[PDB]
Amino acid sequence: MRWYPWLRPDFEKLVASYQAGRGHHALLIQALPGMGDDALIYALSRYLLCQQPQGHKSCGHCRGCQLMQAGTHPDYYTLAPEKGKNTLGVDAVREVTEKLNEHARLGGAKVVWVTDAALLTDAAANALLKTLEEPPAETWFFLATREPERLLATLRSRCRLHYLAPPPEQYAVTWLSREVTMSQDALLAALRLSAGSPGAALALFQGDNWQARETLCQALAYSVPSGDWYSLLAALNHEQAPARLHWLATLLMDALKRHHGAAQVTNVDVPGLVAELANHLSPSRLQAILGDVCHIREQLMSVTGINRELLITDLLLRIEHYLQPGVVLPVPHL
Amino acid sequence: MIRLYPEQLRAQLNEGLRAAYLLLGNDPLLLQESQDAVRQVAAAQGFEEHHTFSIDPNTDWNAIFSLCQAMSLFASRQTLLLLLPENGPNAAINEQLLTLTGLLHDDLLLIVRGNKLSKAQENAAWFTALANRSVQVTCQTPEQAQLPRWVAARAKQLNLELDDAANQVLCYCYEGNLLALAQALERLSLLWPDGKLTLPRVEQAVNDAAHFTPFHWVDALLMGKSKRALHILQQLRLEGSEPVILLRTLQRELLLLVNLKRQSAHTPLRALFDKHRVWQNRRGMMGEALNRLSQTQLRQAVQLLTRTELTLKQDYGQSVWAELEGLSLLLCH
Amino acid sequence: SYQVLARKWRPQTFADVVGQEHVLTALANGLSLGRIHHAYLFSGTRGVGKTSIARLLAKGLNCETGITATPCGVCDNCREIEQGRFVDLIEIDAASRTKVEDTRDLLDNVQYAPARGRFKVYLIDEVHMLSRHSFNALLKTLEEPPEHVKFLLATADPQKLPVTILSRCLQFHLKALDVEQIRHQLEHILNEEHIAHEPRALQLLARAAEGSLRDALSLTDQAIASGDGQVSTQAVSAMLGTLDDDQALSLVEAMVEANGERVMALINEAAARGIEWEALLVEMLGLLHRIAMVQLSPAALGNDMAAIELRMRELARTIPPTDIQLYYQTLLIGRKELPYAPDRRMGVEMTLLRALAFHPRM
Amino acid sequence: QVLARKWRPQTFADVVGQEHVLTALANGLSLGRIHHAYLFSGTRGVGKTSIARLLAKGLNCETGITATPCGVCDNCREIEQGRFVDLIEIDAASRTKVEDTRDLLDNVQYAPARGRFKVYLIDEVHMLSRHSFNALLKTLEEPPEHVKFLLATADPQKLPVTILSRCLQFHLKALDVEQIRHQLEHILNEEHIAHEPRALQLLARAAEGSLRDALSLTDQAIASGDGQVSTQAVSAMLGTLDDDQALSLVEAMVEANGERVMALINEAAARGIEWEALLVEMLGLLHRIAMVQLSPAALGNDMAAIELRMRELARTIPPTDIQLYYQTLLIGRKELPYAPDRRMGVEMTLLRALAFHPRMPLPEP
Amino acid sequence: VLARKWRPQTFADVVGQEHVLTALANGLSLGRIHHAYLFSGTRGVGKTSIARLLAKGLNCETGITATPCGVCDNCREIEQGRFVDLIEIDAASRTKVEDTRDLLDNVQYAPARGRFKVYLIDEVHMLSRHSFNALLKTLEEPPEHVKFLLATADPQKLPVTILSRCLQFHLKALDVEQIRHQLEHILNEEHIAHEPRALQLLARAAEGSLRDALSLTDQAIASGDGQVSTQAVSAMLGTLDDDQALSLVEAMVEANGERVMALINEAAARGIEWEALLVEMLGLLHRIAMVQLSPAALGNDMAAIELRMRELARTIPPTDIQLYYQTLLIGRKELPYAPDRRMGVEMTLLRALAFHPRMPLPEP
DNA sequence: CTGGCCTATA
DNA sequence: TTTTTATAGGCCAG
Ligand SMILES: Nc1ncnc2c1ncn2[C@@H]1O[C@H](COP(=O)(O)OP(=O)(O)O)[C@@H](O)[C@H]1O
Ligand SMILES: Nc1ncnc2c1ncn2[C@@H]1O[C@H](COP(=O)(O)OP(=O)(O)O)[C@@H](O)[C@H]1O
Ligand SMILES: Nc1ncnc2c1ncn2[C@@H]1O[C@H](COP(=O)(O)OP(=O)(O)O)[C@@H](O)[C@H]1O
Ligand code: BEF
Ligand code: BEF
Ligand code: BEF
Ligand SMILES: [Mg+2]
Ligand SMILES: [Mg+2]
Ligand SMILES: [Mg+2]
Ligand SMILES: [Zn+2]
Ligand SMILES: [Zn+2]
Numbered sequence A: 001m002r003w004y005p006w007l008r009p010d011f012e013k014l015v016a017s018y019q020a021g022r023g024h025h026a027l028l029i030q031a032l033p034g035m036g037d038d039a040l041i042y043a044l045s046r047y048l049l050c051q052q053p054q055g056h057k058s059c060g061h062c063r064g065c066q067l068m069q070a071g072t073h074p075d076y077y078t079l080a081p082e083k084g085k086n087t088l089g090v091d092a093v094r095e096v097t098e099k100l101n102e103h104a105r106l107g108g109a110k111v112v113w114v115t116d117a118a119l120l121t122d123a124a125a126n127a128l129l130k131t132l133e134e135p136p137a138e139t140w141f142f143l144a145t146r147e148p149e150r151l152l153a154t155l156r157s158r159c160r161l162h163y164l165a166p167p168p169e170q171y172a173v174t175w176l177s178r179e180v181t182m183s184q185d186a187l188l189a190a191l192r193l194s195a196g197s198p199g200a201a202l203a204l205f206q207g208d209n210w211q212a213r214e215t216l217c218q219a220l221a222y223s224v225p226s227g228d229w230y231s232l233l234a235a236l237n238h239e240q241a242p243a244r245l246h247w248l249a250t251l252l253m254d255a256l257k258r259h260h261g262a263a264q265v266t267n268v269d270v271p272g273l274v275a276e277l278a279n280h281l282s283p284s285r286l287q288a289i290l291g292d293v294c295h296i297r298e299q300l301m302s303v304t305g306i307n308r309e310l311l312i313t314d315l316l317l318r319i320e321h322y323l324q325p326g327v328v329l330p331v332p333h334l
Numbered sequence B: 001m002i003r004l005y006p007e008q009l010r011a012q013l014n015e016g017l018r019a020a021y022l023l024l025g026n027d028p029l030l031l032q033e034s035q036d037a038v039r040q041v042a043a044a045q046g047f048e049e050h051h052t053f054s055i056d057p058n059t060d061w062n063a064i065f066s067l068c069q070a071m072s073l074f075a076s077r078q079t080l081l082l083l084l085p086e087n088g089p090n091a092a093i094n095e096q097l098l099t100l101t102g103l104l105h106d107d108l109l110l111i112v113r114g115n116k117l118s119k120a121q122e123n124a125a126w127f128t129a130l131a132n133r134s135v136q137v138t139c140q141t142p143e144q145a146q147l148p149r150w151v152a153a154r155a156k157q158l159n160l161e162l163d164d165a166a167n168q169v170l171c172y173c174y175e176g177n178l179l180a181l182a183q184a185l186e187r188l189s190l191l192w193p194d195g196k197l198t199l200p201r202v203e204q205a206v207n208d209a210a211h212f213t214p215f216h217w218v219d220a221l222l223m224g225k226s227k228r229a230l231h232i233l234q235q236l237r238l239e240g241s242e243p244v245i246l247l248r249t250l251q252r253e254l255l256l257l258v259n260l261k262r263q264s265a266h267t268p269l270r271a272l273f274d275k276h277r278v279w280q281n282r283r284g285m286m287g288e289a290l291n292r293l294s295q296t297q298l299r300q301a302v303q304l305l306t307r308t309e310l311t312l313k314q315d316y317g318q319s320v321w322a323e324l325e326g327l328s329l330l331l332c333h
Numbered sequence C: 001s002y003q004v005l006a007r008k009w010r011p012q013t014f015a016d017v018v019g020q021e022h023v024l025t026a027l028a029n030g031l032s033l034g035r036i037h038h039a040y041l042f043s044g045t046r047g048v049g050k051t052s053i054a055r056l057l058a059k060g061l062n063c064e065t066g067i068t069a070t071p072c073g074v075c076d077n078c079r080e081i082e083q084g085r086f087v088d089l090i091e092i093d094a095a096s097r098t099k100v101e102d103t104r105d106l107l108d109n110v111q112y113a114p115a116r117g118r119f120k121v122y123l124i125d126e127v128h129m130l131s132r133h134s135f136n137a138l139l140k141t142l143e144e145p146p147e148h149v150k151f152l153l154a155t156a157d158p159q160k161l162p163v164t165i166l167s168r169c170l171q172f173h174l175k176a177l178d179v180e181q182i183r184h185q186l187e188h189i190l191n192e193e194h195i196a197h198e199p200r201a202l203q204l205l206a207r208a209a210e211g212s213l214r215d216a217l218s219l220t221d222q223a224i225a226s227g228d229g230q231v232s233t234q235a236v237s238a239m240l241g242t243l244d245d246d247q248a249l250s251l252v253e254a255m256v257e258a259n260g261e262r263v264m265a266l267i268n269e270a271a272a273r274g275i276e277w278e279a280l281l282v283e284m285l286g287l288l289h290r291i292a293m294v295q296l297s298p299a300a301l302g303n304d305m306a307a308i309e310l311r312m313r314e315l316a317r318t319i320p321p322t323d324i325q326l327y328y329q330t331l332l333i334g335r336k337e338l339p340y341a342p343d344r345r346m347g348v349e350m351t352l353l354r355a356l357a358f359h360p361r362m
Numbered sequence D: 001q002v003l004a005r006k007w008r009p010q011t012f013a014d015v016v017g018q019e020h021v022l023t024a025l026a027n028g029l030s031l032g033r034i035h036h037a038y039l040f041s042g043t044r045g046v047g048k049t050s051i052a053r054l055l056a057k058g059l060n061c062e063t064g065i066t067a068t069p070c071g072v073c074d075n076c077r078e079i080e081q082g083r084f085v086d087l088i089e090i091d092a093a094s095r096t097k098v099e100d101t102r103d104l105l106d107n108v109q110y111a112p113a114r115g116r117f118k119v120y121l122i123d124e125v126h127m128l129s130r131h132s133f134n135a136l137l138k139t140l141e142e143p144p145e146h147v148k149f150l151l152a153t154a155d156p157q158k159l160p161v162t163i164l165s166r167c168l169q170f171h172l173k174a175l176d177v178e179q180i181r182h183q184l185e186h187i188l189n190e191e192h193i194a195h196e197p198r199a200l201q202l203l204a205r206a207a208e209g210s211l212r213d214a215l216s217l218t219d220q221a222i223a224s225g226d227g228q229v230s231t232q233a234v235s236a237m238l239g240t241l242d243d244d245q246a247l248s249l250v251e252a253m254v255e256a257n258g259e260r261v262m263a264l265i266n267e268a269a270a271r272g273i274e275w276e277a278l279l280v281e282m283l284g285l286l287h288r289i290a291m292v293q294l295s296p297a298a299l300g301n302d303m304a305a306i307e308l309r310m311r312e313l314a315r316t317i318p319p320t321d322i323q324l325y326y327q328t329l330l331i332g333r334k335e336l337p338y339a340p341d342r343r344m345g346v347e348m349t350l351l352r353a354l355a356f357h358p359r360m361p362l363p364e365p
Numbered sequence E: 001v002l003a004r005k006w007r008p009q010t011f012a013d014v015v016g017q018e019h020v021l022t023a024l025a026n027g028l029s030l031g032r033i034h035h036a037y038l039f040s041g042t043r044g045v046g047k048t049s050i051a052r053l054l055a056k057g058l059n060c061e062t063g064i065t066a067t068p069c070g071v072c073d074n075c076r077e078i079e080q081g082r083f084v085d086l087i088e089i090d091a092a093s094r095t096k097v098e099d100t101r102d103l104l105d106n107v108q109y110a111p112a113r114g115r116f117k118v119y120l121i122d123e124v125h126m127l128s129r130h131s132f133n134a135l136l137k138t139l140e141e142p143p144e145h146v147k148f149l150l151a152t153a154d155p156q157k158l159p160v161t162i163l164s165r166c167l168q169f170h171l172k173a174l175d176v177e178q179i180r181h182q183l184e185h186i187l188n189e190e191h192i193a194h195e196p197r198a199l200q201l202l203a204r205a206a207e208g209s210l211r212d213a214l215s216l217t218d219q220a221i222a223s224g225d226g227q228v229s230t231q232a233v234s235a236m237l238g239t240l241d242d243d244q245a246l247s248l249v250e251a252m253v254e255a256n257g258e259r260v261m262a263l264i265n266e267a268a269a270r271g272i273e274w275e276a277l278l279v280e281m282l283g284l285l286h287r288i289a290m291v292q293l294s295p296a297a298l299g300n301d302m303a304a305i306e307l308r309m310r311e312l313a314r315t316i317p318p319t320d321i322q323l324y325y326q327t328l329l330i331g332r333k334e335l336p337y338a339p340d341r342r343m344g345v346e347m348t349l350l351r352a353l354a355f356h357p358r359m360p361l362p363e364p
Numbered sequence F: 001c002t003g004g005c006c007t008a009t010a
Numbered sequence G: 001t002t003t004t005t006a007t008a009g010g011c012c013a014g
């Protein structure tokens, strides 16, 4: 969990309110992945739990800070998911909501960090509602998401919103150039793939990840001219599919942008693949395929347990059908 | 080690008893029947004390040290039974067994029930040094091919006279559930002392109760026999099979079909099967399929199997069984 | 002893409640007539007075002064309810205590008479989460409680309750609070709190409340931290994501002119200014609506548009009504499906791109 | 106090509808042919619990097993107050487990304390675990002479077939607009409460077949209208608007005249009427119209004041056209959540109507 | 009660089931008694009735016989309810192991009246794993004076390790005539008036169960005030119709709009959940479209609905069938938005009707 | 009253 | 060679 420089002022504004004792008991921070909301919170958590605060700072030498420092501090609850899983269940919430009525087991404040509100089960969300509207005293909640609009209506209105806007593109690229050594064009794409978030950007270069985009790009460079899109299975069928599908989505879109002669593309670093999409596919089909590729991505992410291989396979067999002349293409609904 | 089919057992247990009787297989009736044929003849050779013992990996190193002790001379002859885990003899139990292999008396008679064994499980020292001493009984069930003979065989041992056509009708109704086929004859001989089981006579005394695995279904699809399929579905329902399982087993195959069908333009049929490690007995069946089904039908099958996966796990839908009845028909044109 | 506005200002007497005047009336009305039911159910969207009112009805039943519709708030009994400490208002977090075993306990302790109050009032909130079995356990008792017992159910999502449960209740559907309703209330509060505000920023806040007082109060408390102490127009608008009127129209224009290169290039400067995408889409839906309207009668364009009106009327004259509906339609669906696409930006891009390639008919 | 509870019929005479159930029972008590497992089913509020209790009351009446219990003998009055030591009203939804059912069984053998019969009435019986169902099986097929089972439930399909085959099933039907109305009147009269005759038609309808839903609705009508059940009160509470203004906008729409459509919306707007509400009454009308086309007598009994005009519309407009207006007004609904502004959305929906109007489209450039 | 009174006390008295009875007869007759019988089949087709006869014929004072006498002390004693050596366990209320262990501790002591100790375990599917294990031990080593008659409607639940120790007799469902005849018999003996077709309607409604039949009659006899009339029975069965969805498919294809909108009204009384009617219809349409690809697509399941279905299949155009289908699915997609769920289903059929290919809707 | 096991609903 | 998941209700042996 790292701390990024673009947090300083967001932190300094949020602590302030707390420092006055007028902090809001239920802050929902919205940040892209990799924007460092987890560290922004930690900072806020640590400050709330330290018994000898040096202004904004946590001292390190008080009992509180020590315990916090060593995993175990009785009054800090983390609500992430069970290790094997990707939802955050109701039973897990209910422990935290109960123990919260016990006087602070070290007579301080109690802080609850909900790592990603998106992961609250529908049942977990509601269970959180009454405690969240009116917690005991000196209780402090922190939740985070990508997208507040995906969050239970009633949960949303008990929180105060704080927006973690990402730094200017320029700043972020200069940030990056100092962490990885890649082409300028590269950074820029990685960054743009990542909706602006440096570090979410940076994370692309760290994994097996960028090596795998190059593989998607290679494969794609073949399917386009030839019409073999089932050929993509191998580069897409992988646990990281939602991400790689999103990569493919942005390529289709960049091509659609060139059919319109737009200045920004996203995949700045592969303007050759972008052009070949523009050349061998009609607007009508670039667009339709963009449609389906996103729509599956959603399902792949939002349907518990759904079979990746079957879904990606059907998507590829079906794209090939769209390629045929005169087939009827998909048009969003409702 | 004298390998046997349950029918043959009765005779080679009369010749000579042997220190070890290995009952291996899957079929619930061939096991019970064999089991009992042995216990019966053991009492009758002086055996009073009979002990049973199910071996989980749960049996401690104190539960297997109360079995090795369970055989000391001279006690009136005792019949020690052992039951087996799903996996068979693990590395922990592969060794406990080794301890029993040399403790063999005319006083202690070993009986062992369970599934078939992995080939290097069978070839694990203790088992082959039991080998010239032991008898082994194949209890696998007969399949849609091998089955009628087993019926016309049992039919005769119960001295009943079955017709070509009545045989056909028992095999349809009771496939994969011998224990019901067996009572089927028992019930028919009480019905008619004649012993003559004309078709129409046997017809009236039957009920439909086959047991299939999801594999049976995909096979019927692969070979384009639709009426068979639909029967399999209807029975798979009433046994309450998780339909999720059906989806996934149809898919391993339907996706493989997609992928063969494509490449089959470029590389010969045979090289492809090799490429993919396609079990030999499956291979003729597969080609049949690849021949009847277009590269489009396959695609429609894939789209339609996908709609029913979503319909199941996203929409929490009822449809599923009927969506599969229909998928099943599509793959048979 | 600080607490968020959203919490402090919970109406503590009927007199202090905003709107919902049809509920407040039948409640006060029945309390007075003597026609007091045993199972009131309270519904509506988040933050419009559901459980604030339940709690008010409970003070009203138990008040030391008498069963009233206008409860004092100055007897041991109203104070205790205010603070949650009152023994004979049993408040259940249904969303937490959903299990039958739990609600069967509830029942086993109904037969017993009230401690210090006149009625034993069960307030089951977020009631839509009780299990199926829990709902049915209540069936017999909810229909036929002891004379000393009253049930007050509240939920945001009443669709989810079995129809057998509804049959047995009086259902009061609280309306969403009106834009002005929310606004006057915002004014009052910021005044009593002694905080500086600018009229037009209350305007933006009420709109953005999207019908809900709590929502509204939470936005306000966000204004007050973001704003350094003031709730100014400048501040709220930066925070909310509000648009300067030109940028929206320019996009509508480039959109109908099938001008790809410009729609994208124009979204890109929007991206840089940090615009709230759902706002864009909405403002855009709004202009398309004017336009289609004017085409009906020329006088339907507002005084409010003056600086735009030249560009509006053109779009009205040029573009066929039919083709404007497809534009509206397409951006509406696009807003709906917005939070599902991989970025918010990418969603606006797929949406406008789709719309772009309409222009020529045949 | 509370209507829904006060008016529970206390004799068969007092029960509304359900002739087919009432007749059968009565025909059978005097006929001396009396089952041991009666099962009562049908939607909420149609009289199953109250019939069940009436049967019990009739089975034990000190005068004799009779279809017309006397409502005065100790047993009758006692059953009415719910404190009769031989009518065991079992709340199946709390006693759901087997170990519970087993206790009920253990005490079946024992003979009644005061009456001809020990009557178990097992209400909301569909909640019993699978286990406790089968536990009932044998005792339900072959009880003792002095035992009777009255099962009642909202949904019977939940009951194992093995249970059903064992009992007489009386499925009470939901109630006619007219049947409910008559009752709502009787009660309001007897209870001395001023009412407008139409407020009753309006409630009887909103009741959606349920007599309880009806009374519950009336109760809060009495409260909303302050001691009076008035049409203004009722349609306020129901979100109906009084029927002219809805229809008038439909007509304006089919007649393609925009000015009036928009005007009628501006007028809807000063009243503040609820936007989804309006869209709904309109589909609500567009339907009855498509309906009346099909079968003529099908036009409702509630809209006498509007029929002249409705009839006219069914006459003059092609079904294919009407399915269009409904379609269009429907997705309008689907869209309303997402439209910028709930009004704007309703406005825009009708504009779509005019732009795609079949008989006089909006003017192309 | 009819269901109780007319319980066969003699083998002759039993309806159908001839393939069980005959084997039982001959086994008693020819000295072949298994140590354990299991009787299965659906609700009310003779499962336990036959169990209780095997007991009479097993202990008759005349001897072991196919033709028990029903008059000896032992035979009226069992007919009655209290025969010292017929232990009829209600295995559903006594399922725990404690209870089964205690039953079986007395298995060893001899029978104090007749030839055999007969344990008659009914609705036996309910016993625990552990109560089965315990039962098994005694069925593997049956005492001689002991026999075990096991009955359950759902045998699929007994362990394979028990099914393998009982001769299992699967009772058949009774045929419409088989049921009709017994109806006529009984109704006459009780001296009760009936029209030929009232009985044909009852038997059909019973769905193959002789109990569901007698239960349906007792009630019939009430609605008729002592007479079983077609006027009357037809009435009562319409009270109880599952019908509504299959019926609307038939009445939709035939363009009969009064019958279509009256069925929609019939549905409202029975008190339907509307999105559910729709779904039974889409689901019927599907099932039919497949009995167009093969006959085998109609289930073991379908029987009472069945005759109707095969005819619906023959007499329809399969391009038409996917036509209706598109319209119903859309009505569904539309139904939460339609103003009244009822109105929704109505306008969905009204749409189905005006866009009828075969006989369209009249235009002004 | 725990831990093993089964089931139904969404 | 045989499989979605989160929450719930429930039965049983010892
Ligand atoms: N009608 C209203 N009048 C005044 N304040 C209100 C009203 N509705 C909501 N609020 C504000 O919203 C906060 C939460 O309200 P609450 O009554 O819990 O809404 P809910 O219906 O969602 O339970 C209250 O504390 C109060 O500040
Ligand atoms: N047939 C009916 N006749 C008169 N009142 C009825 C009838 N059905 C329902 N009610 C009214 O609704 C109340 C609740 O009825 P109840 O019989 O409990 O319905 P349920 O069938 O759902 O148990 C009754 O007390 C009565 O006032
Ligand atoms: N074959 C049959 N002959 C005559 N009556 C029957 C027959 N089957 C069922 N019945 C009727 O149903 C009643 C109960 O039958 P039963 O044998 O207990 O059904 P189950 O198989 O469900 O235990 C009997 O009293 C009898 O009246
Ligand atoms: F937040 Be409220 F109870 F909808
Ligand atoms: F109100 Be009823 F018993 F469903
Ligand atoms: F007694 Be049966 F199985 F209904
Ligand atoms: Mg609330
Ligand atoms: Mg009731
Ligand atoms: Mg039985
Ligand atoms: Zn510190
Ligand atoms: Zn007071």
Ligand SMILES: [Zn+2]
Residues within 6 Å of the ligand: D060, D061, D062, D063, D069, D070, D071, D072, D073, D074, D075, D076, D077
């Ligand atoms: Zn009386």
Ligand SMILES: [Zn+2]
Residues within 6 Å of the ligand: E060, E061, E062, E068, E069, E070, E071, E072, E074, E075
């Ligand atoms: Zn006799």
